Amino acid sequence: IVGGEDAKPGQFPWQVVLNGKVDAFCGGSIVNEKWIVTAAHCVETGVKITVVAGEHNIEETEHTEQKRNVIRIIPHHNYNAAINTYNHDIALLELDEPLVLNSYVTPICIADKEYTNIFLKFGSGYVSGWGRVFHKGRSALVLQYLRVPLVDRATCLRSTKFTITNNMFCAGFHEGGRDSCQGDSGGPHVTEVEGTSFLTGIVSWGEECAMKGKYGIYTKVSRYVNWIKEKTKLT
Amino acid sequence: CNIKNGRCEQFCKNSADNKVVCSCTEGYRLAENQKSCEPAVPFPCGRVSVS
Ligand SMILES: *C[C@@](*)(O)[C@H](CCCNC(N)=[NH2+])NC(=O)CNC(=O)[C@@H](N)CCC(=O)O
Numbered sequence A: 001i002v003g004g005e006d007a008k009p010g011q012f013p014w015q016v017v018l019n020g021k022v023d024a025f026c027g028g029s030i031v032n033e034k035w036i037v038t039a040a041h042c043v044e045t046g047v048k049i050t051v052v053a054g055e056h057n058i059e060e061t062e063h064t065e066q067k068r069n070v071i072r073i074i075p076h077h078n079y080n081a082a083i084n085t086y087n088h089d090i091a092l093l094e095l096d097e098p099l100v101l102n103s104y105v106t107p108i109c110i111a112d113k114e115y116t117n118i119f120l121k122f123g124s125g126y127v128s129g130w131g132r133v134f135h136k137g138r139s140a141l142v143l144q145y146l147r148v149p150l151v152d153r154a155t156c157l158r159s160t161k162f163t164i165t166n167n168m169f170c171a172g173f174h175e176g177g178r179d180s181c182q183g184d185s186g187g188p189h190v191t192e193v194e195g196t197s198f199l200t201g202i203v204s205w206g207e208e209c210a211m212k213g214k215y216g217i218y219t220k221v222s223r224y225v226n227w228i229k230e231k232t233k234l235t
Numbered sequence B: 001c002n003i004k005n006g007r008c009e010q011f012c013k014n015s016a017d018n019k020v021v022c023s024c025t026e027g028y029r030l031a032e033n034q035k036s037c038e039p040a041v042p043f044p045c046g047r048v049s050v051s
């Protein structure tokens, strides 16, 4: 996250970090005690991955961390149907053992398709992660967060040569300086509705980070909430 | 549901006679005022409880 602030412990208790052949390589959010939602481009291939919930500072111990192994990865079935487009950039991870929910480990809410879009169109969401804090720079030790405005589709389309599909949205500032970035992929874009946060987007891609005239591109979660609910049922 | 979400804290559906029915997401119950959403489990989704 470029141009954000330090989170307080427990401020984003749905946020998790992913670790693998690279540490802190992506984020995710808690769907329920057994399931994380993240970006499909984070988990191409079946390399072994671990999830850490209740994480705050990734170089210190808070005694709130819960580490789990990933036993099943379900990228959306249309991800990579077309090469290099980031269309349908969303995936689910099943954990080996249930998370234990508490103040530091809490799911994000997920509304139906209609209300997820209504919440997105409120026009202001929070994004969070341990990704780069400068474009091509170092990663964060302390979880970062940033409020980003929704950007109108036409402006969105004009900002880039790359294709923005109806499964995506733009968010960020016209003057640049504040954005998500590499390492933040998979992290949740959330909309707060009278004290209760709902998942409205997933950090997916962009051109550099925080450049004036460019915006962060997010997976539009409203299009996928039916799929998330179908695949993450507990029994 | 037209204005202010029908006064529903979370979800609104139009019923009949221009009236509304509110509802809430998993982990919440419709409060008795039939608008607000109250926690129905120790750690409901989407809320900060460290503070
Ligand atoms: C995988 C995930 O961490 C990143 C998130 C980048 C978000 N960028 C902004 N400005 N909000 N996703 C990617 O790296 C996907 N590939 C791209 O974004 C490429 N266009 C740029 C790759 C690069 O600059 O390193």
Ligand SMILES: [Ca+2]
Pocket (backbone or CB within 6 Å): A055, A056, A057, A058, A059, A060, A061, A062, A065
């Ligand atoms: Ca830590």
